[PDB]
């Protein structure tokens, strides 16, 4: 059956300011990821060219609880729209050996984002 993973959106966490906790989410097709705005001022949005081919773009409203159903295998880099430049991202890995992970790692993104992404992947 289907699993749900809860993610908190915070002003401050273990990795510093403006964080998703956890920032690495492992899931399977059909699972849900529930994004909880523990602190105000956050949302979640897919990043262009950093979700699998065939997955639908998504953008939640600031300060709303948002439930994402993941269907397409692969890796997804998501941001908090206001805080992307401050490093507020999460990586969702759906299925084994996501085919687009190396592409996401090599994609153009802000330096602080890339540093956090590298730490996330190492914590895998
Ligand atoms: Cu934010």
Distance 83 CA to ligand 1 centre (A): 5
CA distance 12 to 5: 20
What is the CA(52)–ligand 1 centre distance, in A? 23
Q: How many CB atoms lie within 10 A of CB 14?
A: 9
Here the tokens at position 43 are 């949302």
Distance 57 CA to ligand 1 centre (A): 18
Six token digits for residue 28: 């399977």
CA-closest candidate to residue 7, choices 17, 24, 49, 16: 24
**C-beta atoms surrounding 40 within 10 Å:** 9
- Return all residues near 19 (Cβ < 8 A) that are at least 6 apart: 10, 12, 13, 87, 88
Question: What are the chain's domains?
Answer: 1-124 (2.60.40.420)
Give the distance (Å) from ligand 1 centre to CA of residue 1.
31
Binding-site entries: 42, 80, 83, 88
Binding-site residue set for Cu cation: 42, 80, 83, 88
Angle (nearest 5°) at CA 76 between 66 and 23: 70
Of 95, 88, 94, nearest in space to 120 by CA: 88
Nearest Cα to Cα of residue 76 among 66, 63, 90: 90
Cα–ligand 1 centroid distance for 4 (angstroms): 21
Contact 33, 2 (CB under 8 A): no
Contacts 24+ apart (CB under 8 A), 113-119: 113/79, 113/84, 113/85, 113/87, 113/89, 115/87, 116/15, 116/23, 116/87, 116/89, 117/77, 117/89, 117/91, 119/15
End-to-end Cα separation, the chain, in angstroms: 24
Using alpha carbons, select from 98, 103, 96, 119 the residue that is nearest to residue 49.
103
């Amino acid at each position: 059956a289907s699993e749900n993973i809860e993610v908190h959106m915070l002003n401050k966490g273990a990795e510093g300011a403006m964080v998703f906790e956890p920032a690495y989410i492992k899931a399977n097709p059909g699972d849900t990821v529930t994004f909880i705005p523990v602190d105000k001022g956050h949302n979640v949005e897919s990043i262009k060219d950093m979700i699998p081919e065939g997955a639908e773009k998504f953008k939640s409203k600031i300060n709303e609880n948002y439930v994402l159903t993941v269907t397409q295998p692969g890796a997804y880099l998501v941001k908090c729209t206001p805080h992307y430049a401050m490093g507020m991202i999460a990586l969702i890995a759906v299925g084994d050996s996501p085919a687009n992970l190396d592409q996401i790692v090599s994609a153009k993104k802000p330096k602080i984002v890339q540093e956090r992404l590298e730490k996330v992947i190492a914590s895998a």
